[PDB]
Symmetry: C3
Subunit: 65 residues, 3 copies
Amino acid sequence: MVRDAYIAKNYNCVYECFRDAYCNELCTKNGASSGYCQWLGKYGNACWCYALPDNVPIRVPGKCR
Amino acid sequence: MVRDAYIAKNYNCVYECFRDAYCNELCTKNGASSGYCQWLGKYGNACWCYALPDNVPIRVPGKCR
Amino acid sequence: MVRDAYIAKNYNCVYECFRDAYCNELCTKNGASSGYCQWLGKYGNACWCYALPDNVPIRVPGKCR
Ligand SMILES: CC#CC#CC#C[N+](C)(C)C
Ligand SMILES: CCCCCC[N+](C)(C)CO
Ligand SMILES: CCCCCC[N+](C)(C)CO
Ligand SMILES: CCCCCC[N+](C)(C)CO
Ligand SMILES: [Cl-]
Ligand SMILES: [Cl-]
Ligand SMILES: [Cl-]
Ligand SMILES: [Cl-]
Ligand SMILES: [Cl-]
Ligand SMILES: [Cl-]
Ligand SMILES: [Cl-]
Ligand SMILES: [Cl-]
Ligand SMILES: [Cl-]
């Protein structure tokens, strides 16, 4: 299954960003259809991916550790 | 079927917004993959949903009533 | 197959834009689920389409000619 989400890294942490292309490269390398750099969002300036496969971790409620 | 669209409420009216998370919560609660708050768009500052199921009303050409 | 991409015109050139609705109309007329006007991106201010069918050309690495 796929989902639109903030791609995460160890452990439960978003990827920050400035440029859309940075996030699109990151997200698509990880199987998403595309992604972009969301500014001033829930997790600050962070990468949002569309249709990211569920073998890739995502940000969920809770702490980044 | 699903479509990308402005989610609507009675009758043929968009949801205004400030924050992306507001729209993402609204859109996903209604079955969309995600959504965001479009600023300065066709209907002002309004929620846009990706892959919103067709059992949820959307904004179509015409008046909000 | 579909892909998220910059819709292109002859030859390997993006469509520039100001308004999201301009790009959404262009992209959806060409079979995409939606599109928007990306500002200050890889190709300047240009139209990005979601789920654009592969019978529509897209921007790929290289020169616009
Ligand atoms: C300023 C600004 C801005 C923006 C944006 C966006 C988007 N998509 C990727 C959700 C369509
Ligand atoms: C007003 C200028 C907008 C450029 C910033 C674009 N983002 C990187 C925030 C795309 O979501
Ligand atoms: C230039 C700062 C951008 C933050 C606004 C982001 N929106 C809420 C308009 C996202 O589309
Ligand atoms: C800060 C105001 C944002 C309006 C510009 C929106 N775009 C046309 C860049 C949408 O991506
Ligand atoms: Cl985080
Ligand atoms: Cl943004
Ligand atoms: Cl927020
Ligand atoms: Cl309205
Ligand atoms: Cl916007
Ligand atoms: Cl408009
Ligand atoms: Cl170009
Ligand atoms: Cl943008
Ligand atoms: Cl760039």
